[PDB]
Design a binder for this molecule. Structure first.
Ligand SMILES: N[C@@H](CCS)C(=O)O
Ligand SMILES: [Fe+3]
Length: 186
């Protein structure tokens, strides 16, 4: 029975219930993530920015079933065009706005990756992506407002691919956590 999360802590407890089994009800997970109303005090501990690029801050390891993390995007910070390593990926805005640009999987032949579509994800909205849907880029295009987002991936992954927009060529990337459970992890 899906109830509204009263706090981030409550959200985490609910997510543990929803991932207790071997499968994922994506619509239920998205609904509960959307239903949590971002409260900056509850996640300030995790909102550790870097001047030069976005940061990934681990919040919960989901008893192995998922990683829950907070990403902090300075003005002008964005991601590569990337995949999600055969995992479910949910993205909820906690602060600010992010531009999501969708791309198709490239063909073998080298070619410009043309954007399929784009949308602006606004505060408290939750997006969902997986490799069967396509690839995406996520960017804070604001000149004046930092953005903060809450990401859930299941199963957890720490490697993915970045795609060259000019050719479609992919390279393996390993991502690191800027912090874990509020502690900077250089
Ligand atoms: N998956 C990316 C963030 C955009 S969804 C990352 O883990 O850094
Ligand atoms: Fe992504």
């Amino acid at each position: 029975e899906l109830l509204k999360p009263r706090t981030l802590a409550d959200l985490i407890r609910i997510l543990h219930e929803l991932f207790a089994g071997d499968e994922v009800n994506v619509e239920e997970v998205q609904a509960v993530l959307e239903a949590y109303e971002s409260n900056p005090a509850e996640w300030a501990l995790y909102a550790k920015f870097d001047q030069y690029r976005y940061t990934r801050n681990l919040v919960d390891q989901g008893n192995g079933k998922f990683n829950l993390m907070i990403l902090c995007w300075g003005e002008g910070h964005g991601s590569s065009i990337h995949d999600h390593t055969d995992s479910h990926c949910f993205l909820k805005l906690l602060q600010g706005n992010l531009k999501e640009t969708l791309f198709d999987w490239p063909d073998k032949k080298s070619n410009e990756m043309i954007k399929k579509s784009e949308r602006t994800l606004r505060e408290n909205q939750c997006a969902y992506i997986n490799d069967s849907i396509g690839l995406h880029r996520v960017e804070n295009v604001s000149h004046t407002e930092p953005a903060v987002s809450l990401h859930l991936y299941s199963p957890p992954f720490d490697t993915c691919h970045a795609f060259d927009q000019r050719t479609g060529h992919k390279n393996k990337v390993t991502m690191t956590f800027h912090s874990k459970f509020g502690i900077r992890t250089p």
